[PDB]
């Protein structure tokens, strides 16, 4: 689905999860590394990341999970065999990459679309005034009340 | 106002102003701002005639 929605990885960030579980249950290189390298799937990315989500327990705290993340990425296969990039693992690196890419994309796209939304409100004015020059922003409930008064009259 | 030449001119002016602030022009300005610095700052050194 990611490859369908972003064939070129223009704003795609990839993350693996359950890395601490993956230490004893690592996804085999022959399928996971081809995903990290964008070869098994057309999905390209701004970077291939990984974070730990716990050991399957639902009550785990934020700090615990982050600690387990640090232990895993210090000791485990995701880095020692060079699938994922060291600067692209752990919660903080993923969060910072997402924030930076997000807010740059925001500064570039929101100004254009905000000028376009000024245009959008004038565009709604264009059609609306032609449709109802005499009456503006009329609602069906208001119309019902008016009809009720007229009918009782 | 309908079928009036001056009104048509004013409408054209508005339409052309919106095109003047089009995303093509806006991206041109944004890229031009970096280009004014890229391959630049050589000029101030160039003005010296000592090499000449």
From Swiss-Prot, chain B:
Residues 16-52 form a coiled coil. The modification N6-acetyllysine is found at residue 34. It is found in: Mitochondrion intermembrane space. Constitutes the soluble short form (S-OPA1) generated by cleavage by OMA1, which plays a central role in mitochondrial inner membrane fusion and cristae morphology. The transmembrane long form (L-OPA1) and the S-OPA1 form higher-order helical assemblies that coordinate the fusion of mitochondrial inner membranes. Inner membrane-anchored L-OPA1 molecules initiate membrane remodeling by recruiting soluble S-OPA1 to rapidly polymerize into a flexible cylindrical scaffold encaging the mitochondrial inner membrane. This is Dynamin-like GTPase OPA1, short form. It comes from Homo sapiens (Human).
């Amino acid at each position: 689905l990611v490859s369908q929605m972003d064939p070129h990885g223009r704003r795609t960030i990839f993350v693996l999860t359950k890395v601490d579980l993956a230490e004893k249950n690592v996804a085999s290189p022959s399928r996971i590394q081809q995903i990290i390298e964008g070869k098994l799937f057309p999905m390209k990315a701004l970077g291939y990341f990984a974070v730990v989500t716990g050991k399957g327990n639902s009550s785990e705290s934020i700090e615990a999970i982050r600690e387990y993340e640090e232990e895993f990425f210090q000791n485990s296969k995701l880095l020692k065999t060079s699938m994922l990039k060291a600067h692209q693992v752990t919660t903080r690196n993923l969060s910072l990459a997402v924030s930076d890419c997000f807010w740059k994309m925001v500064r570039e796209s929101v100004e254009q679309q905000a000028d376009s939304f000024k245009a959008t409100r004038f565009n709604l004015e264009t059609e609306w005034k032609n449709n109802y020059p005499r009456l503006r922003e009329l609602d069906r409930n208001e119309l019902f009340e008016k009809a009720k008064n007229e009918i009782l009259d | 106002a309908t079928d009036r030449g001056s009104e048509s001119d004013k409408h054209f002016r508005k339409v052309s102003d919106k095109e003047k602030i089009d995303q093509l022009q806006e991206e041109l300005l944004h890229t031009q701002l970096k280009y004014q610095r890229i391959l630049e700052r050589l000029e101030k050194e160039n003005k010296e005639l000592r090499k000449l």
